[PDB]
Amino acid sequence: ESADLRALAKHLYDSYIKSFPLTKAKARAILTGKTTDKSPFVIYDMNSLMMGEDKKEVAIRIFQGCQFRSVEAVQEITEYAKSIPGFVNLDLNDQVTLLKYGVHEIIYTMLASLMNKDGVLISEGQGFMTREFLKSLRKPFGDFMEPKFEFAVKFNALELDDSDLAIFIAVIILSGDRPGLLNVKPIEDIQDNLLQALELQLKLNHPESSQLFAKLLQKMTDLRQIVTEHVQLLQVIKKTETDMSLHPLLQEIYKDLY
Amino acid sequence: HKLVQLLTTT
Ligand SMILES: CO[C@@H](Cc1ccc(OCCc2nc(-c3ccccc3)oc2C)c2ccsc12)C(=O)O
Secondary structure, three states, rough: HHHHHHHHHHHHHHHHHHHHHHHHHHHHHHHHOOOOOOOOOOOOOOOHHHHHHHHOOOHHHHHHHHHHHHHHHHHHHHHHHHOOHHHHHHOOHHHHHHHHHHHHHHHHHHHHOOOOOOOOOOOOOOOEEHHHHHEEEEOOOOOHHHHHHHHHHHOOOOOHHHHHHHHHHHHHHHOOOOOOOOOHHHHHHHHHHHHHHHHHHHHHOOOOOHHHHHHHHHHHHHHHHHHHHHHHHHHHHHOOOOOOOHHHHHHHOOOOOO | OHHHHHHOOE
């Protein structure tokens, strides 16, 4: 029954607002300057960057900033997952598995929310780091950012809002094909229901957007390639920056990943 | 490990 699917959509959206302090609506508002008293500090060079610290080398400092952002995101995403119906009753190991494989896909999905073709918002939106600056970073760090912008510009053209994103994120977390899942069936059952709520949500919220549902599903698969590309660049860094290491939470998510 | 503690916190 459709009424149930709308209640599911609504519960997911409310859970999303409770889990993610900075929403896409608030981010587009900041990026387009349609917010009250607060335009973000712009980081576009070494100097700009240094100025920001108040309000090692460059590439490394930005890399670890992305890491702290990432560890924070894992915690927010984890809380959101605990509010998806049926999720907490799944085998605790499959919950870990779903999270281990799904968290960065959501990070990049959500990261698109803070991006436009020219840069990305940082630290709860108090800063804006230009795309050109991120591209000036010493190899291999520069190519960490560009493919995210490439996906984000195309992802954002789909015009999904927060209520759309909430179901989209939920469908991603509940993927029965993650490696090493013990109980596939109950995960697919919850995902089938989430997929029906998503289809209805996209049809009611974007009645004129042709084949939006199918386009969105494709993006779910694209996100996987994004992660793959990312992990292989991290392999490089682990190998050529032997004195560097990832934050503990990230190390645990990345080990034995695929 | 850390994931487990985050998953079961209330
Ligand atoms: C190191 O990659 C992270 C994922 C991640 C997490 C966050 C990410 O960037 C968006 C936010 C961002 N924040 C910063 C920053 C810089 C200085 C101080 C504090 C923050 O830079 C960026 C681009 C990006 C961008 C490309 S990868 C990534 C991971 O592997 O977990």
